[PDB]
């Protein structure tokens, strides 16, 4: 059936502990406000040195380090290579984004919220996407002191994880609640401890 | 740094002289949508949803990698054979869920700041090498053009468990053992 594409790379000018020589090519697409602001940046990288790039905002290949003038000047002289790279803003970025609307951007994994111990740890695990709001409430009062939160933890399996800690001195009748808001949740999850 | 609501890498293309070896993958919002098995010429999507509704021709990946092989040789010569610099990777071990005895869980070993992308990530159970129930992500790209890779250890939490993530990399003097604190 029909297949999506990636960035087609340009060919370099040449004709034709253990040491290692590494090459990377990154066809990168940036999206903002849906399909209202799209930007293509293809990156040519030797080891860790990005030496030549195409920026759709610029429209031509540009050299980044003294290693890229021969590549950038040659790719810009090839009319079809330059035109096809510009058109990848449509054939790659804008096209594949429409397939993300059908799949990735509709993926909703509800988070699992648990509390355990003084210090109270609210574990918010296995959620997607990466937009989340975790707040501690003591007797219907949002805690705003002594709340240390770990950074957003990427599990690498299309789920995220975050742990919010609350240093609390428990008292008679004190009910502590972890509030979690997430796009997959019509109402925020509230978990009490007391 | 480009600010955007979503970032996709429709083409993380990798090729290196050691091996030699390569990698082709697409990423969206920092996660791997698929990689292409260059030896078996197969696209391997990472979610069931992708396997049912998304399609990518492996020949496009094989062709791009062949260009990378040619571009690498050219820039090796242009740079006076300037070799890659070995970075020191940083290793972090944590669990996917809060750990409860008898409830099957997963240990996650994040190996960050990898370069060159040649690494050996293995697990140890009480000093014994774990060879089964282990999986791994591809090399995932970073904006500084290094990589990170995540290894998964499925385990049944028990009282007498000692798990370590052993990482071997040229940037390390010795193999790095990262013991998992039960937390």
């Amino acid at each position: 059936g029909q297949v999506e594409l990636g960035g087609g790379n340009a060919v370099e000018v040449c004709k034709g502990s253990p040491e290692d020589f590494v090459y990377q090519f990154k066809g990168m697409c940036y999206f903002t406000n849906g399909t209202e602001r799209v930007r293509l940046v293809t990156r040519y990288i030797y080891n860790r040195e990005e030496y030549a790039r195409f920026d759709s905002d610029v429209g031509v290949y540009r050299a980044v380090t003294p290693l890229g003038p021969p590549a950038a000047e040659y790719w810009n002289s090839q009319k079809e290579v330059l035109e096809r790279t510009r058109a990848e803003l449509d054939t790659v970025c804008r096209h594949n984004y429409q397939l993300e609307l059908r799949t990735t951007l509709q993926r909703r994994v509800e988070p699992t919220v648990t509390i355990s111990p003084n210090l109270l740890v609210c574990s918010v695990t296995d959620f997607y996407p990466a937009q989340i709001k975790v707040r501690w409430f003591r007797n219907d009062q949002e805690e705003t002191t002594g709340v240390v939160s770990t950074p957003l933890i990427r599990n690498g399996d299309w789920t995220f994880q975050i742990l919010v800690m609350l240093e609390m001195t428990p008292q008679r009748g004190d009910v502590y609640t972890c509030h979690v808001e997430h796009p997959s949740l019509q109402n925020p999850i509230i978990v009490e401890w007391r | 740094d480009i600010v955007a609501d979503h970032v996709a890498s429709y083409g993380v293309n990798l090729y290196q002289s050691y091996g030699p070896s390569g990698q082709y993958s697409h990423e969206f919002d920092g996660d791997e949508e698929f990689y292409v098995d260059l030896e078996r010429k197969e696209t391997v999507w990472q979610l069931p949803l992708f396997r049912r509704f998304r399609r990518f021709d492996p020949q496009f990946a094989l062709t791009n990698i062949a260009v990378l092989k040619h571009n690498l040789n050219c820039v090796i010569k242009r740079s006076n054979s300037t070799a890659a610099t070995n970075e020191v990777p940083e290793v972090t071990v944590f669990s996917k869920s809060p750990v409860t005895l008898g409830q099957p869980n997963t240990l996650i070993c994040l190996v960050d700041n990898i370069f060159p992308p040649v690494v050996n990530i293995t697990w140890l159970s009480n000093g014994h090498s774990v060879t089964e129930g282990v999986s791994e992500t591809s090399f995932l790209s970073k904006s500084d053009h290094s990589f990170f890779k995540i290894s998964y250890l499925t385990f049944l939490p028990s009282a007498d468990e000692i798990y370590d993530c052993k990482v071997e990399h040229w940037g390390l003097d010795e193999p790095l053992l990262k013991h998992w604190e039960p937390e």
Partner: T-cell receptor
Amino acid sequence: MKTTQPPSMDCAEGRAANLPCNHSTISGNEYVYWYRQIHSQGPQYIIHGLKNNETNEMASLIITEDRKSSTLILPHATLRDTAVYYCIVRVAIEGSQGNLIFGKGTKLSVKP
Amino acid sequence: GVTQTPRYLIKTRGQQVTLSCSPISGHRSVSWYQQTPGQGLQFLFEYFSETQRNKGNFPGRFSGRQFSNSRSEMNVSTLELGDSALYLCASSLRRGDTIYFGEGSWLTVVE
């Protein structure tokens, strides 16, 4: 194949030829290519386009807004333009990604 | 442009034929086609970096090869009368760029 064309078409010499092509199942990552073949010669590339209109020394290419059809405009048709004109969608399909599959085309006869 | 030899060939049934193609200078992708009055212009196979990529629907008798200089050869084994055709070679700068055809090799298989 994704393109259909009228089998034959006549054009008066010195007029412009407007050869139509339909391709409703075209994808957003597929280009439209036009070739021709005079007699027993190798096929000749004419022009290609994605969405915009294109013009080179040989012809213009008009792709409709919905991209479901296109038209090749040959200016000042001469006897040397008598050929079979092939409208080809360079498909993005598994196992044939980037292929140029030739159809029956349009036999253009430039009448003096 | 694309150079193709031999221009005209005469073979008998059961023989083999090798067709040579020199792409446009700098071009690295090469594609082969067979043109008959019956089947029309039919795609054989495509080469880049010395390896076959996309392939048409022809039997194993039709094989090809590409050298490190991007020149390509094509071979037909156990020739049949229906193999008489125009055999066209086309090249493009990269795989996926505009392909430009040569003039072809005219093969006649005779009894």
